[PDB]
From TrEMBL, chain D:
SUPFAM superfamilies linked: 4Fe-4S ferredoxins
The protein's name: Photosystem I iron-sulfur center
Mode of membrane association: Peripheral membrane protein
Gene coding for it: psaC
Organism: Dunaliella salina
Catalysed reactions listed for this entry: reduced [plastocyanin] + hnu + oxidized [2Fe-2S]-[ferredoxin] = oxidized [plastocyanin] + reduced [2Fe-2S]-[ferredoxin]
InterPro entries per record: 4Fe4S_Fe-S-bd, 4Fe4S_Fe_S_CS, PSI_iron-sulfur_center, PSI_PsaC
List of residues binding [4Fe-4S] cluster 1: C10, C13, C16, C57, S63
Stretch forming the signal peptide: none
Xref: Gene3D superfamilies: 3.30.70.20
Enzyme class: oxidoreductase
UniProtKB/TrEMBL annotation, chain E:
Organism of this sequence: Dunaliella salina
Statement: the UniProt record of this protein carries the keyword 4Fe-4S: yes
Residues holding chlorophyll a 26: W202, H287
Binding site for chlorophyll a 32: H286, H359, T495
Annotated residues for binding of chlorophyll a 55: Q477, H525
Annotated binding of chlorophyll a 31, by residue: H286, H359
Name of protein: Photosystem I P700 chlorophyll a apoprotein A1
Binding residues annotated for chlorophyll a 29, in chain numbering: W258, H285
Residues the entry annotates as binding chlorophyll a 52: F472, A473, H526
UniProt-annotated binding residues for chlorophyll a 28: H208, Q236
TrEMBL record, chain G:
Lineage: Eukaryota, Viridiplantae, Chlorophyta, core chlorophytes, Chlorophyceae
Positions contributing to chlorophyll a 2 binding: E28, R31
Name of protein: Photosystem I reaction center subunit IX
Binding site for chlorophyll a 1: E28, R31
UniProt record, GO biological process: photosynthesis
């Protein structure tokens, strides 16, 4: 009558099903998130991820900074976030051109885990596609944070 | 039964405990807006070239640091400066 | 032994709660090992990955990631319960390989059925110096 | 992996095969000692380099030597 | 079932075993072939588990060793009482506690050494002590030196009795394992008898003899005209004159009219304005309550009369859904292994020592103790170090138990098995918490350093610029201050003056002033939390991975104290549980040094000082809030601004502190030689020296080897801790004695 | 798994715990009622509620500890009836 | 008695006989004869 047990009836693996992971509220919520969605196209995945990140990478940068006390300059201090998401897109493309090397294809193991196919995000062109979507999404999210922070109304 | 030799793609741990497959997320034609928008940077050399040309923004950005009025180029202040450093000599 | 016992599935694995130290992404991408033995009764042994598990009667099969873990469980069962285990190495494709005991008697016996390898008929100290084996890629011991 | 060597000054006490924790060394028959057996090492690719065989060797100097070399996934003791 | 199982005359009493030095172990009986035999003889002298597997013999050995320790402590206590009786100035300090400094050690004039005999005042000269023995001897009435002489003689008699008891219980009447395994009887007698009767007897002493300190000594009466303690015990009129409730004579106690004893059983929240310590009547009422609590607590378990409880039943009746079985074999674990009990006892003992350190400076309980900054800082620092050493020892013995007395048969699905099952998750989470605390607690200091260096003081984490205030502690302080008005009506005031608003001062010097909290307090508190998490990470990893790790699967059979497992797998040096304790000891030192530094600087800059008519002036310039935000502030305003007394201490009375300061530095610098080098280098160097001795035929009969791999680590950590602790000791003592 | 035991009758303690909180009238008038009247002036987005407000934070924390400990004991005692845990 | 006198020949004969003798000799020399910086020649 314990809430903790192994996964698939085989306990010799490291992942032991604990309440946190087992939790249906956690299971369905994680699946709903834009990265775990496999059928949706990679460009689409990258845009959603980039929008959320580009928007959250502005506030902590515009409130605490070198020009956080200058009124109009403080709004203009959010550009750095754009430079940050630019550095993030560059390192993401660098990881894609090296993770799934041309020599190493699938990398083996089809993976069962209930009737469903391998995510195309792990391909060579799929990571570049994701890198694109993340770049447009981050640039657009930073621009939305800057536009919304001046017409937010009673912020 | 706990281990199989042929169907080893299910007995060792090769699973997806958080992924569902569906062809729908975003509304109709919204995806098309983002498809055309993300088509240009879709390639590796394309994005690396984008950020490489966008890297010149730091060079140009520093030149337009006049609005920022950074201590660097504003002045060093002639009135007060450390030209009297040390007590043995006026300058050195 | 007299014939390499082919590893077969559908063997009763020991009752054990879910551990945390074992079968990572290498156990699937590269290789992993599996130990089988025969138990005469119901006892509780200590796995080399965490807590304790019981010994299900009849055959027993366990899977690990390193050969040292299977060898550690092998010596524990041979010195604490007087058993005779044997483990295999399963590759990524699915090629099973017999590993211990290869000759099948035990690795500490003679059996007169194995040829010696990696032996130097000279004594240590009679090896030539580093200067002699230069650009030869070989070493004094290798020579 | 590491290179293990067994010299002729071996006495065949079978202690290194008992001290090896990865089943690398074995005992083959010989005709040069009182025990008429000499150690060997067929599974050199499984050598990890813990040097327990050298501590188990009773003769002076050691009849078995573990010369460390290149490292692989098996010789580095990686479980991931 | 609970009886007295004794086995008379089990070991003879002769000196035959004293001849052969190595006899407890079967390995050292062969004699000393190599110099390593001497070090093995000393390192295995107390490892009783390695002597035999007889639990009864092991239990008898530890029972006699306890009596030997008690005799040693009693001899030391008697020595302190005798020194205070003959070589001190207690009688002179008793008539002027605010002007004469304590001293209880006189040095003989051999090579120089007259300078150490410093003029402490009162027509006496000697070494100034910082132990607080004079304040303790003031708290329980003690006027002349005859009582201290009698206490020293009585303690020596009790020490001889304890040593005789140890010899008797190991050679003449040794108990049995069935006698030692009565944990219910032991808990019943330790809670009811030891603690309860000790509090009741001490309450009686404070009710009768602590009367001069609470009514005549504080009133300005000369200590010679004060009546002897037995006069207050025999004559009821002489005690009734001081406290009128004593005229009732045990009538309100038995007639349940306890309200009549309200004059000598007060509940006053504060300090005595004439002495600076707590009220003696409050401490007496406190001990009386504690005695009743423990006396009613010692009747929980069942021994021989049916009524009571069973510890095995209480443990086995606690099974939940998240822990499987839970507490299944905990009774069998705690009743058959000494290391498990030792780990639990050492953990709670060290934590208790830390509690003692905090509450002593917070609520000073001895008269004229708060105005003695030397003894205050000394007592706090000493109790903190003793507590930290004990917690590291607890982390050591838990791994010793897990390596030797852990049987994976009686623990199938209990808490111990589940904990060892998810050890990877535990260690990984503790690792992340450690890294997060380090970045967020040290990057703020480095950030303030860079912001101050770059000329931008408005961009640093300080009270003037961007701040971080500890609102939770500020709210708790406010709650404790306004608490005696709503949530403590019978209390006169707050239990301490740490959060109050009324500064008390005895003799012009501040006793206990309110303590404020700012951004620097937030920063140093996060520093403390970070170092505590790293120490618990190293110790807990060692305990959870001491059995068998995923890298080395046979670590249990390798033992507890082993060098490594060879140069395989890239290298496995210090993979043993003992090595984790060695690493832990280092981190405990790094944590407690910052704790005592924070205490000394905060007290010297915010509480201690001297009060005048135009305000109160602290010891330092009150620079705790404006100089603790930067790392350069510590090195400049603490170690460099202070320690000038230690530096300029030559030729003065406290000249030994400069020598101790430089000497401690050498020991710490000497530890690095043993800690960085290996063993093969020293073995080959020793070989060359052996050749030189062989050339002159002075080759030692016992061949001279180098130290072991674990011995070099042990020698290095011992020298390191000794050097660092003695450095901080000499600095603290010289600074607070020459200033406070 | 995937069915963590929750009964809709568990609210009986969090709903029967308050009557029990209103009982004590010796100090002020009630722990819970005092919590309600003191929180009553801090509901329309007021800056009040600083460390000086001993009637808001303290009553909130004390009342919450009582409510959470009784909800915990209620779930253990209710769901423990079927699992042979009296 | 033989065991006690042979016990007294291990560590006390070298750490408490010689140490006490040498320390007492140097201390009594520095006590009766005060502080010596030259051969007093
Ligand atoms: C003069 C009386 C006397 C005599 C003749 C013996 C004789 C013997 N005892 Mg015994 N014993 C005695 C008194 C005596 N004991 C007392 C008073 C106690 C209680 C503490 C014990 C408790 C005891 C135990 C538990 C054991 C013995 C054992 C033994 C036997 C061998 C151990 C040995 O060599 O002793 C050791 C010789 C010494 C000189 C030890 C001195 C250590 C002292 C006390 C420490 C002093 C602290 C030091 C000054 C601190 C400074 C250090 C610094 C770094 C801080 C031996 C036949 C052992 C045994 O029976 O073998 C199985 C055994 O385990 N005894
Ligand atoms: C923990 C250490 C620490 C911290 C907290 C800070 C903090 C800060 N520094 Mg700083 N600094 C540090 C160390 C640190 N520093 C060190 C060691 C150095 C020397 C190398 C410096 C040198 C330095 C300089 C030269 C400057 C600063 C500046 C600043 C300020 C703005 C910097 C910035 O880009 O905004 C923050 C940008 C971010 C991207 C922060 C990200 C926040 C993360 C994501 C946490 C929030 C989400 C969190 C994970 C919650 C989880 C959510 C859940 C759903 C998962 C800021 C308050 C600037 C300043 O002017 O100060 C006012 C500045 O010029 N620092
Ligand atoms: C302050 C720290 C310190 C000290 C004192 C030493 C001291 C020494 N090192 Mg060393 N070393 C150190 C740090 C230190 N090292 C560090 C950090 C390293 C890098 C890991 C090294 C690496 C190193 C190597 C590789 C070697 C040395 C060697 C030596 C010895 C040189 C011989 C000599 O100079 O005559 C003596 C100098 C002294 C300072 C003697 C100190 C003893 C005095 C007299 C105090 C005596 C104690 C007193 C009687 C009280 C005792 C009682 C007490 C136990 C309670 C010497 C003892 C060499 C050697 O072995 O020489 C043959 C050598 O091979 N060292
Ligand atoms: C109410 C009776 C009583 C009292 C007062 C004590 C007191 C004590 N016990 Mg004990 N115990 C008792 C009953 C009692 N015990 C019973 C019935 C059992 C059997 C289950 C045990 C089994 C037991 C064990 C196994 C151990 C103790 C130990 C201790 C000592 C702990 C030392 C300490 O922590 O600081 C306190 C120190 C003091 C208060 C100093 C006082 C010193 C005096 C001489 C103590 C005299 C009390 C004594 C029990 C009187 C009866 C003996 C009589 C024949 C002379 C302490 C003096 C530990 C020990 O042995 O330490 C030596 C320990 O290992 N006890
Ligand atoms: C736990 C320690 C303790 C002790 C030892 C005492 C002791 C004493 N208290 Mg007391 N007291 C205490 C705690 C204590 N108190 C506490 C906690 C409170 C509440 C705060 C009080 C409050 C209090 C009050 C109000 C009074 C006392 C008083 C007294 C004295 C007389 C009481 C009396 O006559 O009772 C009974 C005494 C006995 C029954 C005698 C014991 C039997 C003897 C020893 C037997 C020996 C006989 C033997 C078999 C043969 C003799 C040997 C011979 C042949 C050589 C007495 C000396 C009174 C006082 O002030 O005295 C002036 C009094 O007024 N106390
Ligand atoms: C209740 C206290 C307590 C008790 C009873 C024990 C008991 C034991 N411990 Mg232990 N331990 C403790 C606390 C305690 N420990 C604490 C507080 C720590 C943290 C420092 C440790 C850390 C520890 C470790 C790492 C180890 C033990 C080990 C052991 C076992 C054998 C020890 C031995 O052989 O003694 C030998 C006696 C000595 C070595 C003498 C000590 C000399 C010290 C190091 C010098 C200190 C210098 C001194 C303070 C100042 C001198 C200055 C100089 C000028 C003279 C033994 C059962 C060992 C074991 O293997 O367990 C099975 C083991 O390796 N303990
Ligand atoms: C000053 C020396 C020093 C330093 C800096 C560290 C630092 C660290 N030790 Mg360590 N250690 C030391 C000495 C030191 N140790 C010594 C002498 C010993 C022997 C006893 C040990 C023994 C020891 C053990 C046993 C362990 C550690 C661990 C750790 C890590 C814990 C991380 C953490 O929680 O805090 C935070 C980390 C830091 C604050 C590092 C400083 C980073 C600053 C803020 C720079 C910020 C980044 C900068 C802006 C970027 C630079 C830009 C550049 C690339 C251009 C940490 C990084 C533990 C560990 O591994 O972690 C879990 C561990 O278990 N240490
Ligand atoms: C073993 C080295 C040593 C030597 C050579 C001496 C020598 C001396 N000691 Mg002495 N002593 C020593 C060790 C030594 N002591 C130690 C270790 C202690 C501590 C226990 C003492 C404590 C001591 C005291 C208390 C006294 C002496 C005194 C004396 C002197 C007179 C004794 C006498 O006449 O004997 C024979 C002379 C032979 C030349 C004498 C010159 C006495 C003295 O002061 O003289 C007035 C004195 O009272 N010693
Ligand atoms: C202030 C202290 C630190 C604050 C943060 C602490 C969180 C970090 C560690 C949490 C790990 C979670 C894994 C739980 C492991 C676990 O689930 O154990 C199981 C336990 C329930 O077990 P059972 O009911 O089955 O146990 C019954 C029998 O085993 C009885 O022995 O659940 C809980 O522990 C509830 C407490 C959750 C965590 C509470 C924190 C405890 C710290 C002290 C109390 C703090 C209260 C608030 C004060 C501010
Ligand atoms: C120096 C050193 C040695 C050599 C250690 C030795 C030789 C021990 C020295 C012990 C001495 C001999 C003890 C006595 C000390 C003095 C003689 C005391 C002075 C007393 C005089 C008054 C006579 C190691 O063996 C070692 C091993 C592992 C890591 C580091 C090291 C290491 O650093
Ligand atoms: C160590 C063995 C001796 C143990 C008993 C010690 C008895 C000591 C009794 C007190 C002696 C005090 C003598 C003081 C003489 C000078 C008096 C002036 O203050
Ligand atoms: S080094 Fe270790 S693994 Fe290699 S042969 Fe020797 S004992 Fe075996
Ligand atoms: S331990 Fe040494 S002597 Fe013995 S069999 Fe092995 S190589 Fe030969």
């Amino acid at each position: 009558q314990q809430v903790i047990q192994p996964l698939n009836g085989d306990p010799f693996v490291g992942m032991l099903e604990t309440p946190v992971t087992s939790a249906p509220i956690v299971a369905n919520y994680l699946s709903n998130l834009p990265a775990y969605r496999t059928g949706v196209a990679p460009n689409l995945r990258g845009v959603e991820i980039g929008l959320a990140h580009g928007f959250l990478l502005a506030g902590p940068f515009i409130k605490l900074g070198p020009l956080r006390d200058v009124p109009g300059t403080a709004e203009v201090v959010g550009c750095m976030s754009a430079a940050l998401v630019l550095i993030l897109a560059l390192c993401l493309s660098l990881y894609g051109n090296a993770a799934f090397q041309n020599q190493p294809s699938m990398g083996k193991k089809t993976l069962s885990g209930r009737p469903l196919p391998q995510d195309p995000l792990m391909s060579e062109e799929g990571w570049a596609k994701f890198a694109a979507g993340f770049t447009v999404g981050g640039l657009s999210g930073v621009a939305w944070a800057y536009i919304l922070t001046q017409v937010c109304l009673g912020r | 039964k706990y281990f199989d030799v042929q169907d080893l793609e299910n007995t060792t741990g090769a699973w997806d405990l958080y992924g569902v497959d569906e062809m729908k997320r975003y509304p109709g034609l919204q995806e098309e807006f983002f498809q055309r928008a993300t088509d240009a940077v879709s390639r590796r050399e394309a994005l690396n070239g984008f950020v490489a040309l966008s890297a010149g923004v730091a060079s140009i950005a520093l030149f337009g640091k006049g609005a920022s009025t950074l201590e660097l180029p504003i002045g060093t202040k002639g009135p007060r400066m450390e030209k009297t450093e040390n007590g043995k000599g006026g300058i050195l | 032994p007299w014939k390499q016992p082919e590893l077969d599935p559908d063997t009763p694995s020991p009752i054990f709660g879910g551990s945390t130290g074992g079968l990572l992404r290498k156990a699937q991408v590269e290789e992993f090992y599996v130990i089988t033995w025969e138990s005469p009764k119901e006892q509780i042994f200590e796995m080399p990955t965490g807590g304790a598990a019981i010994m299900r009667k009849g055959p027993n099969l366990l899977k690990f990631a390193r050969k040292e873990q299977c060898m550690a469980l092998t010596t524990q069962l041979r010195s604490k319960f007087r058993q005779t285990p044997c483990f295999y190495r399963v590759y990524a494709d699915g090629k099973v390989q017999y590993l211990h005991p290869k000759d099948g008697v035990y690795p500490e016996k003679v059996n007169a059925g194995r040829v010696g390898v990696n032996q130097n008929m000279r004594s240590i100290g009679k090896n030539v110096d580093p200067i002699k084996v230069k650009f030869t890629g070989s070493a004094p011991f290798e020579i | 992996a590491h290179v293990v060597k067994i010299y002729d000054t071996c006495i065949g006490c079978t202690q290194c095969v008992r001290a090896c924790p990865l089943d690398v060394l074995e005992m083959v028959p010989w005709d040069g000692c009182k025990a008429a057996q000499m150690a060997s090492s067929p599974r050199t690719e499984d050598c990890v380099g813990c040097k327990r065989c050298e501590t188990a060797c009773p003769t002076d100097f050691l009849s078995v030597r573990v010369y460390l070399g290149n490292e692989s996934t098996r010789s580095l003791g990686l479980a991931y | 079932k609970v009886k007295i199982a004794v086995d008379r005359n089990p070991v003879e009493t002769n000196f035959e075993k004293w001849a052969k030095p190595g006899h407890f172990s079967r390995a050292l009986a062969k004699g000393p072939n190599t110099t390593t035999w001497i070090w093995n003889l000393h390192a295995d002298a107390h490892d009783f588990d390695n002597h035999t597997s007889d639990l009864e013999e092991i239990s008898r050995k530890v029972f006699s060793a306890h009596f030997g320790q008690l005799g040693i402590i009693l001899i030391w206590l008697s020595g302190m009482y005798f020194h205070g009786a003959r070589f001190s100035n207690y009688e002179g300090w008793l008539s002027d506690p605010t002007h004469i400094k304590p001293s209880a050690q006189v040095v003989w004039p051999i090579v120089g050494q007259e300078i150490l005999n410093g003029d402490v005042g009162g027509g006496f000269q000697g070494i100034q002590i910082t132990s607080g023995f004079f304040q303790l001897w003031r708290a329980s009435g003690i006027t002349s030196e005859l009582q201290l002489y009698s206490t020293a003689i009585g303690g020596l008699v009790l020490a001889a009795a304890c040593f005789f008891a140890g010899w008797f219980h190991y050679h003449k009447a040794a108990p049995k394992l069935e006698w030692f395994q009565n944990v219910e009887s032991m808990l019943n007698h330790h809670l009811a008898g030891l603690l309860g009767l000790g509090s009741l007897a001490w309450a009686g002493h404070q009710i009768h003899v602590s009367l001069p300190v609470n009514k005549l000594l504080d009133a300005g009466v000369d200590p010679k005209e004060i009546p002897l303690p037995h006069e207050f015990l025999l004559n009821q009129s002489i005690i009734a004159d001081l406290y009128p409730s004593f005229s009732k004579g045990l009538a309100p106690f038995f007639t349940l009219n306890w309200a009549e004893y309200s004059d000598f059983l007060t509940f006053k929240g504060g300090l005595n304005p004439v002495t600076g310590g707590l009220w003696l009547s409050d401490t007496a009422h406190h001990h009386l309550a504690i005695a009743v609590l423990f006396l009613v607590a010692g009747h929980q378990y069942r021994t021989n009369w049916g009524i009571g409880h069973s510890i095995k039943d209480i443990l086995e009746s606690h099974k939940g859904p998240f822990t499987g079985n839970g507490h299944a074999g905990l009774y069998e674990i705690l009743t058959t292994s000494w290391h498990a009990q030792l780990a639990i006892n050492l953990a709670l003992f060290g934590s208790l020592s830390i509690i003692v350190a905090h509450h002593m400076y917070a609520m000073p309980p001895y008269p004229y103790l708060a105005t003695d900054y030397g003894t205050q800082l000394s007592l706090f620092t000493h109790h903190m170090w003793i507590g930290g050493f004990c917690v590291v020892g607890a982390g050591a013995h838990a791994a010793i138990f897990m390596v030797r007395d852990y049987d994976p048969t009686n623990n199938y699905n209990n808490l111990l098995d589940r904990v060892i099952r998810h050890r990877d998750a535990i260690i990984s989470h503790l690792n992340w918490v450690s890294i997060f605390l380090g970045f967020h607690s040290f990057g703020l200091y480095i950030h303030n350093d860079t912001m101050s260096a770059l000329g931008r003081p408005q961009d640093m984490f300080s009270d003037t610029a961007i701040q971080l205030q500890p609102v939770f502690a500020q709210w708790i302080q406010n709650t404790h201050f306004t608490a005696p008005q709503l949530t403590a009506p019978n209390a006169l005031a707050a239990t301490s003056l740490t959060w109050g608003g009324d500064v008390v001062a005895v003799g012009g010097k501040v006793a206990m002033m309110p303590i404020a909290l700012g951004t620097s307090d937030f920063l140093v508190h996060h520093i403390h939390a970070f170092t505590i998490h790293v120490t618990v990470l190293i110790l807990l990893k060692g305990v959870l991975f001491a059995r068998s790790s995923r890298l080395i699967p046979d670590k249990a059979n390798l033992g507890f104290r082993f060098p490594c497992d060879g140069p395989g797998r890239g290298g496995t040096c210090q993979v043993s549980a003992w090595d984790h304790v060695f690493l832990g000891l280092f981190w405990m030192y790094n944590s407690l040094s910052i704790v005592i530094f924070h205490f000394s600087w905060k007290m010297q800059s915010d509480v201690w000082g001297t009060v005048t008519d135009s305000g109160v002036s602290h010891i330092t310039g009150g620079n705790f809030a404006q100089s603790a935000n930067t790392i350069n502030g510590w090195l400049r305003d603490f170690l460099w601004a202070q320690s000038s007394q230690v530096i300029q201490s030559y030729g003065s009375a406290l000249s030994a502190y400069g020598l101790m300061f430089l000497g401690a530095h050498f020991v710490w610098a000497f530890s690095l030689m043993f800690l960085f080098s290996g063993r093969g280098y020293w073995q080959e160097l020793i070989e060359s020296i052996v050749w030189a001795h062989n050339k002159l035929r002075v080759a030692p009969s016992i061949q001279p080897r180098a130290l072991s791999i674990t011995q070099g680590r042990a020698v290095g950590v011992a020298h390191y801790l000794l050097g660092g602790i003695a450095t901080t000791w000499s600095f603290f003592l010289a600074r607070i004695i020459a200033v406070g | 798994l995937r069915v963590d035991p929750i009964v809709p009758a568990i609210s009986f303690v969090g709903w029967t715990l308050p009557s029990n909180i209103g009982t004590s009238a010796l100090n002020g008038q009630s722990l819970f009622g005092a919590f309600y009247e003191s929180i009553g002036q801090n509901l329309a987005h007021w800056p009040t509620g600083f460390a000086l407000d001993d009637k808001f934070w303290l009553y909130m924390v004390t009342w919450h500890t009582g409510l959470f400990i009784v909800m915990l004991l209620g779930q253990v005692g209710f769901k423990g009836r079927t699992e042979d845990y009296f | 008695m033989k065991d006690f006198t042979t016990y007294l020949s291990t560590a006390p004969v070298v750490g408490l006989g010689w140490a006490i003798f040498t320390s007492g000799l140097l201390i009594e020399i520095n006590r009766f004869f005060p502080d010596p910086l030259v051969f007093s020649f």
